[PDB]
Amino acid sequence: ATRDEKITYLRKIIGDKGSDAWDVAWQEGVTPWDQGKIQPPLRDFIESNDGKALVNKKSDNARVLVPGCGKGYDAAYFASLGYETLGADLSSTAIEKAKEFWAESPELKSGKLSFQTLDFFKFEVPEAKYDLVYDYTFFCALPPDLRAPWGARMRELVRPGGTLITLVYPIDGARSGGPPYSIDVQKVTDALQGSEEGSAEPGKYWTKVLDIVPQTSSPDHVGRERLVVWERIN
Ligand SMILES: Nc1ncnc2c1ncn2[C@@H]1O[C@H](CSCC[C@H](N)C(=O)O)[C@@H](O)[C@H]1O
Ligand SMILES: [Cl-]
């Protein structure tokens, strides 16, 4: 019933079942990541001068992807900003629970917000790709050996000149084990910028336009969190 017990159990069933463990955890109510709401740094970015500018330039058919969305607080938030938004999660249980949690959303009603059981690695990316993608407790949910695929998928998911926001948490140093895996901005950078081979300035696929300590974090997130905004180039 404690967080640690639940984490221990979560990691145990991931060891036995692999990625199938996530729907199992959702069915059994072992969801220690679940916070019931978006993280404050997301709202404060959108409400900042850079965030206002990003939202104001959005095209009329701009699309948002929130992968590993869980109960979907972030997808609901982006939909409320006027974006046609898809919350994608591997667990059909999670997706139903998201549909319940946001049952009264006006954007769920209109179809502007949609929740779908999808594998982030496998689903067919729309032709137009995504204008804006938001990753929170998804990169850190993945085994380390899946970080490179995630970077590659992000590269094809975000249209040129589109934006990926990564709320990088938890930044816990050398702590081993996960999920949540201890991550840092460098690990996200390496995944997103791929293989150098030339060992040069990695800004080939993305420009890291903003990398900040959020001014308001959840109490438990203070000192373990950076918000980073990436723009797709080439
Ligand atoms: N390949 C994959 N594709 C889509 N979702 C995945 C996935 N692997 C794991 N997930 C989902 O990633 C989520 C990690 S838990 C955190 C969920 C959400 N970001 C929140 O902040 O509450 C789980 O819901 C899990 O079902
Ligand atoms: Cl919320």
Listed by start position, the domains of the chain span: 1-32, 36-232
Q: Which long-range contacts (CB under 8 A, 24 or more apart) does 99-107 make?
A: 101/71, 101/72, 101/73, 102/72, 102/76, 105/76, 105/79, 105/80, 107/76, 107/79, 107/80
Cβ pair 118, 90 in contact under 8 A: yes
Q: Which residues contact 204 (CB under 8 A, 6 or more apart)?
A: 193, 194, 233, 234
| 140 C-alpha to ligand 1 centroid (Å) | 10
Q: In Å, how far from its chain's centre is CA 32?
A: 16
Candidate of 6, 71, 90 to mutate for ligand 1, largest count of ligand atoms within 8 Å of Cβ: 90
Cβ pair 99, 77 in contact under 8 A: no
87: region left, alpha or beta (phi > 0 left; psi from -120 to 50 alpha): beta
**Strands 158-168 and 130-136: what pairing?**
parallel
CA triplet 41, 81, 72: central angle to 5 degrees? 65
Within 6 Å (CB) of ligand 1, which residues are found? 19, 22, 33-34, 67-71, 88-91, 94, 119-121, 136-138, 141
| 199 C-alpha to ligand 1 centroid (Å) | 32
- What's domain 36-232's superfamily in CATH? Vaccinia Virus protein VP39 (3.40.50.150)
d(CA 87, CA 108): 11
> How many other CB atoms sit within 10 Å of the CB of residue 85?
29
Q: What is the CA radius of gyration of the chain?
A: 17
Instruction: Please name which of 187, 203, 197 lies closest in space to residue 151, comparing C-alpha atoms.
Output: 187
Size (the chain), residues: 234
Q: What is the 3-state secondary structure (H, E, C) of the chain?
A: CCHHHHHHHHHHHHHHHHHHHHHHHHHCCCCCCCCCCCCHHHHHHHCCHHHHHHHHCCCCCCEEEEECCCCCHHHHHHHHCCCEEEEEECCHHHHHHHHHHCCCCHHHHHCCEEEEECCCCCCCCCCCCEEEEEEECCHHHCCHHHHHHHHHHHHHHEEEEEEEEEEECCCCCCCCCCCCCCCCHHHHHHHHHCCCCCCCCCCCCEEEEEEECCCCCCHHHCCCCEEEEEEECC
Instruction: Please name which of 191, 177, 202 lies closest in space to residue 149, comparing C-alpha atoms.
Output: 191
**Which atom of ligand 1 approaches the CA of 120 most closely?**
3
Q: Please state how this structure was obtained.
A: X-ray
Amino acid at 102: W
**Which atom of ligand 1 approaches the CA of 31 most closely?**
15
Q: Which residues contact 194 (CB under 8 A, 6 or more apart)?
A: 148, 151, 152, 155, 202, 204, 205
CA triplet 47, 48, 50: central angle to 5 degrees? 120
| 198 C-alpha to ligand 2 centroid (Å) | 43
Candidate of 10, 13, 19, 22 to mutate for ligand 1, largest count of ligand atoms within 8 Å of Cβ: 22
**Which atom of ligand 1 approaches the CA of 146 most closely?**
1
Residue nearest to atom 11 of ligand 1 (CA): 68
Cβ pair 172, 162 in contact under 8 A: no
Q: Which ligand is nearest to the CA of 43?
A: 2
d(CA 77, CA 45): 12
For residue 180, say if its preceding peptide bond is cis, omega within 30 degrees of 0. yes
